[PDB]
């Protein structure tokens, strides 16, 4: 139902784990905040929800400022962790709950639970006391009761947080279709980039209170603003060679690789804020590593690590110019023993460079799945 | 050190949490119980500790039977999310928590501590406190503390579940590099599949408390022994197509397709247990559907869902013949949108057949990474 924050800080005492954040969430958007472990993910959602003060900057759900606003006069609904039921309440009744201190006819509470029931895969066990153990369920009863009340906005703290791998994958599934049907508005909060990937119209990532970027999951992976959104999105994370600029021109930048080889290497990037002899961060995720066969800025090494999960392989490399090793992703079953030399081609159109500062030079390659100039 | 589990059960009243299990753990061998929530996966564990009782069958850690043995006299080491060290921190002192109490020498002590150091990746923090972070490495001194101990076997119940996916993947690789070194017995417990594949030497899928079957990640992978290990062992789920036998011959089945175009295929299926006119399931990963340029049974349909995540695209397709969904998998980015039309390939060589009973009708086609 719309939500603004404008300048949004939070101070516990003299340190901030909200800086001057500001975020434009529209109508049925699917947001998502992502970022490391206490990167501050839950204050945002709580100064959202009421349940934590904005020491500064204004929030603003549908057009009203919300700062001074009791939580339960909001209009949000929200689950989080390891959720607590009202342990005397049965699974149905756990959850037409907060469907029902909003007034509502039993028709309709009725109508949701049974349809939030088979969905959450619950059905089965409505009449019975959160000794259902299972705690998996028991959270799936929690977030059921968040969905049966449909609230303006949900915010949903790590909600599969309690879930076995599998049941995690089919949540997000479920959490995605659930978004399709209903389509109101959404922030939801994970430490897992996947989970982001999955599930967002629109990913915040977080680090150490700051916005590092927003964007389109596809704007994040191709075009991270640095360092940290590119070593954070990506499930095997993007490889990082230490590099030194040799020569700069329009929409273009050299560089040299750490190879005692030095090859120098062109870049099509920005250029911008970038002088020779300055020393960057050569950016290169596993996927886009090429077989070899593909010449032109080749690297080889001694195969560290090599695992084969059937989709595809992830081999480890030493590369002789400086350890760091190298990880790679080629599809499918690739057989290649421990201590092997492995060799991969470096594609520079697919390489991304950082600045010291930990900046990017933003990528001129044009990249399928993103709105681009021309 | 050696495990074997012999007709092992365990029995709670008059309910079977462990059925019959036989498992036979090789020196060095890095092995890992997947399996759903309550599968049994920690009753198994606490069973080969001594922390339960084996209501009938033989546990032999080594070459004795451990079966009637106090826990603290088996040579196991048992980890379990749950890291704690000193208050006085510092390292070198950890690490130790069993070493310093009984003696052992003040030059062993050293040895112990300074030969998993280095050799762990934390000889150049020995003598540091849990003062500064680290919370991964914090894992490795636990860990540490519990190698130290020098047991013969190790034992670990989902370790990384209180991490973030980030950390719970950089700890994945620590642990199979601390596997390498140290070339101890390991029994790895998860729910998690990818752990599993990452992580085991050899895989043992648990269902309710019997052994769905054992084997290296491909074999598990590449032949599912039934419809429960063919569901359970890869990320996005199989695909399943119910379908009608047809014919069958040597080393081979035919089947027809549940589209009302019911094309029938040939499949280099076993053949074994099947006769015609039966319903079974058809089984094909995500992953190994084909773009559709490679004609020969092609299933089109209408998209229902698009992942995008930049190294790879996954789609979901409704076809026609049938709802079901096909989840379907294509390496970087495909550029289609929710209500296309979509086709993509079935591939004979790579299809999995199911009867009835959910048994698996071994697959013919050899695949690489799997002797024989
Ligand atoms: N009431 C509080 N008082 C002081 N510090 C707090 C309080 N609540 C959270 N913090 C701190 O702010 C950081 C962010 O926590 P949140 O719990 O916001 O993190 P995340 O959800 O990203 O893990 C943590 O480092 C935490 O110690
Ligand atoms: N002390 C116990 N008493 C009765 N049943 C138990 C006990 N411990 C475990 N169980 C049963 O065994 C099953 C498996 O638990 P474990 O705790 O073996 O499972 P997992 O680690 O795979 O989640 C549970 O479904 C539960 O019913
Ligand atoms: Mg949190
Ligand atoms: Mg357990």
Redesign the interface.
Known sequence: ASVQLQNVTKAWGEVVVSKDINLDIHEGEFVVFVG??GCGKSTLLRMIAGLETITSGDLFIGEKRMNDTPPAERGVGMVFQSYALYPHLSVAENMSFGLKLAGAKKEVINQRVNQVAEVLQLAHLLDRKPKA??G?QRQRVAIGRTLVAEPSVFLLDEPLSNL???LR?QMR?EI?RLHKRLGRTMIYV?????EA??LADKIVVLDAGRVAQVGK??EL??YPADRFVAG??????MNFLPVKVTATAIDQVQVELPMPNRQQVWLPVESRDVQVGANMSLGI?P?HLLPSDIADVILEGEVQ?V??????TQIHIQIPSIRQNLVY?Q???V?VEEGATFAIGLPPERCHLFREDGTACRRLHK???VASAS
């Open positions: 490391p472990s153990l299972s998996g076995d791998a599998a994958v599934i995605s994970t430490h897992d980039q996947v990937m999955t999951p596809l992976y191709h954070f999105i990506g499930s095997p994370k995720r996927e690590v695992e084969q999960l059937g989709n595809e992703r599809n499918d079953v057989l990249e399928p799945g």
